[PDB]
């Protein structure tokens, strides 16, 4: 009892983190409002560009902690690109955020903090380019509800 | 690492010849449109090295490497020399850089 | 020399008392080529891949109490599955601690942005909403907005 | 070369060796500026009438939180031939520092990023500009932490 | 945009103000003229009627149109923000201005 | 109950910073010992020349901070002109000052520093020319008392 | 002092009359240009008090002083009140301000 | 900003006429009292240009731009093109500049 009605063509992908991934960022596509079609591969948590052209890259990550153990905490989130022409990981988009400004329950309790980070830009990618979205602290991820963490590309 | 200068710290004597090699890592940059820039020790303005006379250039497109041999070395030509290349594939045009410093000591003048 | 494909960019009305009401009849805003704005909701007029984005800027004139959690979500109720489901969401705590104790107020600002590509069908209803519409900062230029474009 | 060209596009990134100012660059690895978009005076020039997508991110970093109470803003503006006045298209504000500079256990580097994005209808010759009010907290020490771009959809 | 001419008015009971607004966007036309009176100090907003005795001296050359108001007592005193709908391509919007008259 | 005696003068302007305003350079003229008359208009923190002729331009800014962080700070102060004939902002008067070369004070009870900057000159201005006084770091402005920040032109 | 309001801390009864007086000390300011501004607890809007009915303003040019009697003392009007006047001599025109707070509590109402 | 010289950096072929144009962006300078300055690559003295046939002043008064022409480029052709103009308003009198380098292989 299945069919399809619209064609569509642009190579596209919008993958969301695995909720049953207790301590890691595993990208999934077999979920309701997620897409991965028209040739795009996902090799070892990495998006493989299927054709040379102009792509739009976006990703969001949400960090949550139930208390600040030590001021020295850095939340980082960067999207990388390894091309066939230059076989080294280079950052295309990056952002850093400090969730805890001193404090560290000196006069408070477990104060749940939430910090989101969004990344986006347009790039020219060639065939076989491997894009990867990564974060430094995979233990502060909050994927418990819905579309709070994701990563995707679309050929314009 | 998108262009690699081999001799980072060099120490030659007045009257010698240092060779600086740069190797291309991006297969989009071409060994034909290469440029060199020096910054004289103690000054901030970066000057552009000219092709002629003391500056002889060896380019090999097969290995995608270019060099710059500097002859008749003086003690006032000590500074940070960088190499450059022009890259262009699709809609993109960019340039790449390196780094490498030279220090020259003098030889005095035997006063009998 | 015309332009086409479904597009929409709605901005909150500054004259909307403690509420997030979307407006379209203002200078730098568009809603054309079939996109309808019904009940504070965008209606997709044709099936395809759309780009959904929205930003909300939160402002408070002091840390009130405990911990308030600011959320901003774009939801979709489709004709195929008639339940509101969240497509994009983000949570943010604007105040860390030290509620102003005698000392004067310190206005805090925290923005939140959402964006992604999704497949929408005819008759789908998208809505951008926030939990605390009493901290809304819709003063002048587009600080909070919400829009889609048919890719 | 094996691929064809397309529609107006631009993705410019901040100058890392320009500490003190926001200079947009296009002749740097993984940056684009082609198909009619011009970079005049830290401004992008629209080459044709149509619908464009504009975005920009800036990352702010400071050492310790002083008691000045600073407001960090980031805005994308458009000055059109139709309306010769600076109007903001997208804006965002963030207050990073509440508490005073630590008098015990000092140096507390704070990081706060800001992202903007939206689609607009632009005319020929319109000059778009992304700017921030305090260019002294820019963190261009790493690749792609500050950028600005448009692409015609 | 919009350049409404009666910026600050404090005329006396019994005068006549002509209210012109000048368009600065080449997308706005002197075709869609309208004013939004306030009726003294209200916490809402009202409107104002056109088409006859409340007619304008619309002039596209100066991109200004007027509002003839006679026998001003105390019901003809309020904020008359000005408005016009601008349109170039796929965009449709309206714009506001400003100008108040007060008669004692 | 007041009166006025013989003005009989020419374009003049002397605007002062807003004391009860946060970190911004907002010019005021409707305050004691301030002038803006005989055609000079203040539109958007800019002085509008009402008639072609020779003007004298002056401005002072006072910077104060309660400690010197280590980040190489440069304090700048410039008066610029955008003309109808050449619509590019060019500096007529400029000054730079380094407020503290001293290593980040590990302990000095804040060390409050004060640094002023003054600019002045005579120039030929045309009708409709817009003059603007600006500073780079509005977080060190000392608009506490008066006459510490000001900006003016006078038609000679 | 460029205008001085006399009452600083006032303590009134549920619904009574507070009087605030401001005296002009600058002979450039005119008593023919009066304005009033009040503040509300934690609120950030400068409001304009209107002259009529519950807000009575008396002007006497001899001492260049004006007052503001406010009746029906709602307790939601607790805040800092400032006065203003328009001064203009020759080519200059300016205005002046003050400062002063009002506090009022309620009663028992005898709901037994 | 003011004065945008169109051929900034040129690399021409031996025997190829290169045309140097300067476009005025300051609407106060006149293209009628135009001046040209050359500094041959390798010398640190700025020489002037005598426009006598080989250097033609294809000034365009509409665009407030002036042009100069070379012919049969030689192999010693080495020189930095600098243009100037004698702007004049009521009282003030000033000059404006551009920028330009030439290389012949």
From Swiss-Prot, chain D:
Cell compartment(s), UniProt: Secreted
Disulfide bond residue pairs: 65-97
Segments forming domain THD: 8-153
Official protein name in the record: Tumor necrosis factor, soluble form
Outcome reported for the amino acid change (mutating residue 87 to A/D): Biologically inactive
Taxonomy, superkingdom: Eukaryota
Extracellular-side segments: 1-153
């Amino acid at each position: 009892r299945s069919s399809s009605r619209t064609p569509s063509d642009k190579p596209v992908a919008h993958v969301v983190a695995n909720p049953q991934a207790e301590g890691q960022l595993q990208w999934l596509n077999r979920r309701a409002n997620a897409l991965l079609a028209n040739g795009v591969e996902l090799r070892d948590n990495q998006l493989v560009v299927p054709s040379e052209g102009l792509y739009l890259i976006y990703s969001q990550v949400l960090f949550k902690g139930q208390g600040c153990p030590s001021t020295h905490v850095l939340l980082t989130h960067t999207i990388s690109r390894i091309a066939v022409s230059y076989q080294t990981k280079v950052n295309l988009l990056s952002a850093i955020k400090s969730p805890c400004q001193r404090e560290t329950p000196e006069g408070a309790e477990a104060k749940p903090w939430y910090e989101p980070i969004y990344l986006g830009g347009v790039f020219q990618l060639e065939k076989g380019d491997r894009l990867s979205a990564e974060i430094n602290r995979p233990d502060y991820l909050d994927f418990a509800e819905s579309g709070q963490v994701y990563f995707g590309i679309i050929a314009l | 690492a998108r262009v690699d200068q081999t001799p980072q710290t060099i120490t030659k004597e007045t009257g010698e010849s240092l060779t600086i090699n740069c190797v291309l890592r991006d297969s989009h940059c071409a060994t034909s449109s290469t440029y060199w820039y020096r910054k004289k020790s103690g000054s901030t303005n970066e000057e552009s090295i000219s092709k002629g006379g003391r500056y002889v250039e060896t380019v090999n497109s097969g290995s995608k490497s270019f060099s710059l041999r500097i002859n008749d070395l003086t003690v006032e030509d000590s500074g940070t020399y960088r190499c450059a290349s022009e890259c262009q594939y699709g809609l993109a045009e960019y340039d790449v850089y390196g780094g490498g410093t030279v220090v020259t000591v003098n030889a005095a003048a035997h006063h009998h």
